[PDB]
Amino acid sequence: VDNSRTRPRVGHIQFLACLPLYWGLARTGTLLDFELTKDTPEKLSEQLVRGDLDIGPVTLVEFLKNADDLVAFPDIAVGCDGPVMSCVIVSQVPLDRLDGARVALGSTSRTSVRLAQLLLSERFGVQPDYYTCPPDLSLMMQEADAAVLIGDAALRANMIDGPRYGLDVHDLGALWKEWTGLPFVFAVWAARRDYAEREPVITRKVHEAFLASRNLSLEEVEKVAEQAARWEAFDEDTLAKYFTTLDFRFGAPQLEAVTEFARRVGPTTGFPADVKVELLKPLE
Amino acid sequence: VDNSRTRPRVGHIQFLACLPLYWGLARTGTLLDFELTKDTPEKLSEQLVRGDLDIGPVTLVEFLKNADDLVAFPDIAVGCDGPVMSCVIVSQVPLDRLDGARVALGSTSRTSVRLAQLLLSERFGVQPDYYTCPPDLSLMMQEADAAVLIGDAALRANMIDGPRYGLDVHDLGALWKEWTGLPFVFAVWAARRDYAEREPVITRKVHEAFLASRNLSLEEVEKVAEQAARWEAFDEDTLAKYFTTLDFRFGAPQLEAVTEFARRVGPTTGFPADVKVELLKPLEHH
């Protein structure tokens, strides 16, 4: 019987937001210590929660709903301080005209949808008739007055589709910053608690490899954008701006934002307003 | 509509035999120009043939059965010149006692099983009662006199299980070399013909990236083995020996071996004995 140690099963978001990180994981050879799974953020969160992955990215709302069973990695996340560029509301009308109007939500999102609902309700005071559908701006603009998008589709609406067709594109990160002054965190990295307790060293090494790969990707952001631009409708300058506008930090100022967002949406989303976020503790 | 160009869909064998190549694809950043799929060699061959992949590894028999629709990459393959270490016959008896005996074959193989049958029949003159079962050396040795294994399971039988339990392990690469003097090629890399003709430059760039990634993996074989040993029952020295015993070349001497193997098995395996292997042509420069 082969009872040798097994690589951690690690998730990775397929969107452009984590393409630089994938570059870093490959350049550092870290990928060869992982058994990697690429998918959308809602699927990767489902897999980690049910046990098909050991470590991976988790959209913030789903982490908070499972905070007792997950331990978040410090100092890396998918966030913003101001505009995030790839989490948007695309609207054919001013936001204050969306009361009772139909608004399409993308099923790939869990956190951005709730943030958009929080802003429209508590900041702008409109209660749209929401419905969820696959991310497809052209279809959404035919059936609804506004749509919430994330990932490459939102980035495409922001940088290309919106300007071409004269559609308003509201940046969810900017709207939150205007409303609260705070940065925002859309996804964190976490280990299953049972895996973190069974394999403390592998969990710590995976954490440190993510930080090393993240740091390298920010040093080589221009290389990453030049290569990625060859496969996208976005050009090199647009990708480099996107990669540098994203905020991958996860320290005290970012946890402050998570705390307040959880407090405002918890009682209407399925977790306590004062939910505890457990961070992976470093070695003494 | 997003009509931008799309990355080639590229397969990659999950076995240890192609782990150094995976290291090179990652270190060179080539992976970020691929949409990669990792799987077993028989699944990756099915996907490429049916159109779920554009470029990828193909076990030799399946390539030969689809040679009209595939274009093989020159100068890279999975092969040997002598022992391959990870394609074996594990037997409790001398091979010449296998006539009418039970021999278990692993369904993960297409080329190694036919090579083992060719050797047992045409070199040793025995006609075993073959049957297929999942790769499980302990189970196979309980129900049969011999078993054919590939991949990590065969390497495990060769380096660990065989010596521990006193079982003979015959290297299919060595047996072929003894019989013919020739090296052997178990798998090649190929593009779908329709993809190669639709995207000639992406195809060429994928080919060149594989050669660059292969070259780097042989330069850094010790690094690769040291890292991989932490996740395997094999130690660093065993993996480094394995990675350097494998032969990743695919030039004239290796095509000579493919030609002769195809001639001996073609008419009983599903392709002409003189099947034509089309290689990706290099660009002429004026």
Ligand SMILES: C=C(O[C@@H]1C=C(C(=O)O)C=C[C@H]1O)C(=O)O
């Ligand atoms: C920055 C982004 O935020 C995303 C928003 C998420 C959500 O709303 O559930 C999930 C993953 C994040 O990557 C993006 O998708 O580009």
Ligand SMILES: C=C(O[C@@H]1C=C(C(=O)O)C=C[C@H]1O)C(=O)O
């Ligand atoms: C070198 C090897 O040869 C393998 C043999 C093949 C087959 O028999 O179908 C397929 C892929 C090769 O990787 C190995 O198993 O490691």
